[PDB]
Structure 1
């Protein structure tokens, strides 16, 4: 354990905190676009429930999709795409 960055949710040691926080303050953090799914798209890799037409989804810049609720929960612990953790 360490100290959690509120911008990206990563925990860092106290002696890494200054340079980490400055970096996260230097550029916009990872974001997604809200959307309503237009057609079924298989299972969400977070919850394993189907991504069904009408679902309230998030589309990340890497083009991955998740339920909005699911990616929001993951972003509380690590603000990164589950499939593209290093972009």
Structure 2
């Protein structure tokens, strides 16, 4: 929605998702925010569409 305009969805190629606490693994659908923080799409996309801010650093993606 608004999410895709301001962030970078892509396939991942040791980093941890801070939402689910699991390691980011090869081929997983992940998303980078303008602040450079990285999350699984599953974990972040619904929350982010509503908050429009990075869970970690609180910076608005817009």
Common fold by TM > 0.5: yes
C-alpha separation in 1, matches of 2:29 and 2:59:
25
Structure ranking higher on relative contact order (CA contacts 8 Å, 6+ apart): 2
Q: Does 1:31 align with 2:6?
A: yes
- The CA deviation string for residues 4-48 of structure 1, in whole angstroms up to 9 with x for no partner, is xxxxxxxxxxxxxxxxxxxxxxxxxx721111111xx42200111
SS of the aligned residue for 1:34 comes to strand
> Unaligned stretches of 5+ in structure 2?
none
1:76 to partner: Cα distance: 4.5
Runs of 4+ in 1 over 6 A off after TM superposition: none
Equivalence for 2:55: 82
Q: Does 1:67 align with 2:40?
A: yes
TM-score normalized with structure 2 length: 0.73
TM-score normalized with structure 1 length: 0.55
Aligned residues between the structures = 56
RMSD between aligned residues: 1.8
SS of the aligned residue for 1:35 comes to strand
Q: Rg: which structure is higher?
A: 1
